[PDB]
Amino acid sequence: AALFFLIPLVALGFAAANFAAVVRKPEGTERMKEISSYIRSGADSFLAHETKAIFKVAIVIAILLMIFTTWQTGVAFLLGAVMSASAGIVGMKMATRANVRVAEAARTTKKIGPALKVAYQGGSVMGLSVGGFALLGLVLVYLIFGKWMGQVDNLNIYTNWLGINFVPFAMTVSGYALGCSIIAMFDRVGGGVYTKAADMAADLVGKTELNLPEDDPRNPATIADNVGDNVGDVAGLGADLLESFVGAIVSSIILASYMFPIYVQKIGENLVHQVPKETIQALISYPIFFALVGLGCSMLGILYVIVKKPSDNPQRELNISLWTSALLTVVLTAFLTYFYLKDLQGLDVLGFRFGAISPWFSAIIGIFSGILIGFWAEYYTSYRYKPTQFLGKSSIEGTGMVISNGLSLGMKSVFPPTLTLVLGILFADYFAGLYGVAIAALGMLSFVATSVSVDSYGPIADNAGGISEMCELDPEVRKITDHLDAVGNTTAAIGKGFAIGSAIFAALSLFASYMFSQISPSDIGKPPSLVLLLNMLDARVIAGALLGAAITYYFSGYLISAVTKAAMKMVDEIRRQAREPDYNRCIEITSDNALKQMGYPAFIAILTPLVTGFLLGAEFVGGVLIGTVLSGAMLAILTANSGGAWDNAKKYLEAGNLEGYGKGSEPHKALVIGDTVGDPLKDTVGPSLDILIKIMSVVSVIAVSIFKHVHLF
Amino acid sequence: YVAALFFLIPLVALGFAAANFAAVVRKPEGTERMKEISSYIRSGADSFLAHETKAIFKVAIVIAILLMIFTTWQTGVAFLLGAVMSASAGIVGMKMATRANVRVAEAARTTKKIGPALKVAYQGGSVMGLSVGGFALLGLVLVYLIFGKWMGQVDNLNIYTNWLGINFVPFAMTVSGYALGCSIIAMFDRVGGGVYTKAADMAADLVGKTELNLPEDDPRNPATIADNVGDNVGDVAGLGADLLESFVGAIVSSIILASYMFPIYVQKIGENLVHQVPKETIQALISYPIFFALVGLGCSMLGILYVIVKKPSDNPQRELNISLWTSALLTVVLTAFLTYFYLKDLQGLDVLGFRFGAISPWFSAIIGIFSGILIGFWAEYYTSYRYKPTQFLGKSSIEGTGMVISNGLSLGMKSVFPPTLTLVLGILFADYFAGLYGVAIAALGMLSFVATSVSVDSYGPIADNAGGISEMCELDPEVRKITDHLDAVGNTTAAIGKGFAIGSAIFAALSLFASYMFSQISPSDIGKPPSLVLLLNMLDARVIAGALLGAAITYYFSGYLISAVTKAAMKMVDEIRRQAREKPDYNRCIEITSDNALKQMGYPAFIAILTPLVTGFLLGAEFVGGVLIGTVLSGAMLAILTANSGGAWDNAKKYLEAGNLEGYGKGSEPHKALVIGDTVGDPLKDTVGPSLDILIKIMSVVSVIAVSIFKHVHLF
């Protein structure tokens, strides 16, 4: 058991070792070194600014979490914030360092294998830092606050000095989750505004009197964009997956903890717990062990792929990493489930239909759902398949036709993945109730380290190819690096789709956790069916649902406008710099403006439940959560798939798959308009929604202990 | 005595419509060129109507046969009756509009004044308004008398079990059948006719830009006449049928809730079933919505009469707003007395949710009314260039085309919050006053004066056709100025009316969701506490799954419609090229586009009608309740977004055309960007949004009906 608790440190040390191993490889030409120095300075500047703002917000949140609820809650909040920030910083430094070494491998060896290995060892640092830091924080919470302080021992509803009631350990893990959520909100909202403002400004300066090339170091927005790629597909997506991972695990824990007070019967004058402390604690700890086994299998798959004999098929290598981790987790967790829950009593009252093996059936379902959902994102965004081919071909009909067909593509694309989620939820429940729904969220993210490593591979290869083309490298070297960039292009779409699906699953598990956390000491005798209830006929619930949907749409629109404003401001600063390059100057101007913009979306996401709950109650807030989730899922999938389809249709034409037309032609102009429209949608709105749907649920789960009984109307 | 006096009101409205029809027909058509252009337009309209009506009849017969085999035969009879009422209103309104398009221009030319032309156009639109009101309430009065009182379905009010074992309260199921009847007409009009309209508009612009280069606004271009036909197909038949469906849906929901409260609030005192809400109150609440709607129609006729007889003026918007406010205020006042005197001596209103006694539902109704107008205003705030958002979009036109698209999407997304919040507060307060019954009464009050709303909505396209005929006939510049002023006023009223229709659709869809939940009552829940029966638990994984599925289906529905418009447009372009290769063929291309649009609507219509049957026989009534919530939420948001975005794009293009952007005018690059934005937005505002308005209601109606079957007959 202690070995499992050690696995997180193994992953952190693995990250350190891969960091050193890639750092040992050669940087090469001095031109490459200068470009990468620009990139690293921009990245570190952005990181410092955002971490300053993060610390400012986190101290206030921890003080409020200690004043209300308990002090362990605020401590766990800060712990989780630190773990996620650490994973992000480590991954970003590693990526900004490895972007050149990948190109040097490709050039020196004139081969694809060594460059791919360098890039994947680079991304595995972010993957392993995510996994290790997250599960390390969780093990620390489970040991220090969990067993040492006996919060897993009492498992009864505690009433704090203010009168707020809650199960202690549940509230503690909730605080930890909220910490991760703050880190992720900062990363996604802010960094996304920044990244897409930089990309839009890069496109813009090309058309001003400056006549600055897009792929030229003379253009400051080029370096800002190369920094933003890392800010996005390494820090942002990694933090998003980390939040979903921890959310699934915390939801399992909260449901388990609150089942203990739920299933008590007043047989005489005594309250008899129909689910005893043994089973409850076993179910509190089973998710942590499942996730630790997942991290172990992830490290094994990464090891196999980094030591594997070098090959010339990158896509195959990354997919091998994924499938190895998946199957290993499946088998090992099979034995874990069967042996860890075998001798427990009362599992039938918990929803386990086939006994101790029920949740494993749930977990694996998640896994498969995930991969399948991934596939759908690729089907509707790759020009290898029919939809993007049709979109690209329709370019000849005009620009309005490109826009309409892209919107149509996204809207229709939301259905296959939603149906995958629907069947996954139905079957997971069939096996093990809402607990099994949470275990499905976990299984889907059981190998988060490998998923995040493949996600971070993309931007590293993108920067490698960009450095190669900015340094005017040999055409064969450019071919190698561009092939790596295309593989990363496909993996990016798959990873974004997987992240959206994971966010939806974790948000639904958090909704269940919210309902369970509504338990008051006065409902102890009441039948369980009466307490765990959100009635949709209650007009406050319908009203709250409409409100949540509207707030989600408004959130998205505000982010679009913020991106455009920040881009125009960066263009103004670049003009000022030309009249009077400024790399960190423009990077920091845009970073500060994006951080200023983040105030209102963050306040929306965090304060909507507080305001509405203290105003109208916990049924209204349940409605708001359902509306937010239902609209966020759809809008996320839509924006992601539409932007991906537009981008890859432009590529389809640029690759000459549409005879007669190439760069500069009118169809290419139309597709470029479509791609500029979609960039903010896929890289800012979708991920921001992935976060919204979860963080609003977390804030709700926590504050419902207060406003459940403290509401104005 | 007085009851029959009110029951006569529908015939008064139908006769008022006939009289206005005749009065405008007496007006002069004028020049032979105007007569020829209008002959083209009217022939196209009649052709479209006939083609769509054939398919409507086929589907309606299949549905009515199924409604007789299952449930009861009165259900199928009421279904066919409602289909006929709505189809009649649509045909009448469209024929009248195609007739009045010339007489408005003749008023503008002969008299060189705005007042007389406005009067001609408003007398034209009041035909559709009054036909909607009269036909709808006539069908409902007939149902309440024949099946209701004569056959004693308002007398038994107990759960009846049909030969198959399907259980339901008879009158509730009957009114549900009638609602489904109206819904079929509305679905046909909206989905099909909307695909047709936007395919026609897209083909007109394309052929204007194709190798043929046939000028826009030219009789030589057949798609120009097809588009002038589509304006009426959309904002007269489509929008009128939509408002009619929302109206009838609110009323039917009130009735179903009332009917099912009788079995719900029973107490099993030993061996006796004691109805805590007695038959007297149940029947009073079944009939109160009908009388409220009749009073509303009377006030609407009065406002319309005042505005058509009022001293002519030079301010048209003021005249239409006067009609609206008069109808609203009169309905408010009279319905106050109606409520207090009709529900005073009842018993059990407390157990029902009436917080302030017999006057509670009136408080709900008026709220609806205000909600409506406020929602209307919001649609105007986010689409008119008199206000900041559309101004900013137009100004941003200078900064590229991608910026136009991004800012339009942003505008639309943000625009859902003010109107959605209006709906939120309306629901909260309406419920506060009189429970879910009061939510239904709020929907009704919001639509209490539907005749005037539909008349103002149908005014728009008639004036649009008048201005188009004026520009195609090369009329005098002053007459053209008058017609262009009328067209802009019609544009604003169109935006406001579309927004009001969306808000009404959301309110009616929520009332129908409540009706679904009430209709789930089984004979085995007689003793169960009401809290146990009226329950849709959101933790049940089935319900969450169904909600996700419904949202996803709504998005897919929208995307399919977008693609269908382009397919029909491309085919119409091919037909125009063939016509050039071989006075052009007007009805030919109109009928080709109509048949293609009707063939395409088959699949969205099948989605909307069968999704609840498939998913319900598969997984049950909790899953379908989830589906309904997802559909309602996603449809509300997408409807508001698409409508407001299309309106903002169009009115920003107009903002520039008037030179409100110093330095840029027709032909400049910002104008090209705004033209792209408008071509993108046309299908969204005129096809997707309304189709969703329909989806969110018709799926609920089908669910309310079939839940009697699949509630207990489901596979998993």
Author numbering:
A (entry chain B): 4 to 583, 594 to 726
B (entry chain A): 2 to 583, 593 to 726
What text comes from the article?
Membrane-bound pyrophosphatases (M-PPases) are homodimeric primary ion pumps that couple the transport of Na+- and/or H+ across membranes to the hydrolysis of pyrophosphate. M-PPases are large (66–89 kDa), single-domain integral membrane proteins comprised of two identical monomers, each with 15–17 transmembrane helices. The helices of each subunit arrange into an inner ring (helices 5, 6, 11, 12, 15, 16) containing the functional core (active site, coupling funnel, ion gate, exit channel) and an outer ring (helices 1–4, 7–10, 13, 14) of largely unknown function. To date, H+-pumping (H+-PPase), Na+-pumping (Na+-PPase) and dual-pumping (Na+,H+-PPase) M-PPases have been found, most of which require potassium (K+) for maximal catalytic activity.
Following the inspection of enzyme key regions and structural alignments, it became clear that all of the data from 0 to 60 s could be combined into one, yielding a grouped structure of TmPPase in the resting state that is essentially identical to the individual 0-s (r.m.s.d./Cα: 0.33 Å) and TmPPase:CaMg (r.m.s.d./Cα: 0.29 Å) structure. The structure was solved at 2.54 Å along h, 2.95 Å along k and 3.38 Å along l with improved B-factors (108.65–70.28 Å2) and Rwork/Rfree values (21.95/23.61%) as compared to the 0-s structure (23.81/27.40%). The improvement in data quality parameters also translated into better electron density maps, so we could model most side chains and build additional key loop regions, for example, loop. Despite the presence of PPi in the crystallisation condition, it was not located at the active site, nor did it bind anywhere else. There were no observable significant changes in other regions of the protein, but the semi-conserved glutamate E6.53 appears to be flexible in all the structures as indicated by the absence of 2mFo-dFc density, even in the high-resolution 0–60 s structure, or negative density when modelled as seen in TmPPase:CaMg. Ion binding is the first event, as there is no evidence of PPi in any of the structures before 60 s post Na+-addition, nor in the grouped 0–60-s structure, and the ion gate E6.53 appears disordered: Na+ binding precedes substrate binding. Our TmPPase structure obtained in the absence of Na+ (0–60-s structure) suggests that in low Na+ conditions, E6.53 is not tightly coordinated at the ion gate, allowing it to loosely interact with S5.43. This could thus explain why K+-dependent Na+-PPases can pump protons at Na+ concentrations <5 mM.
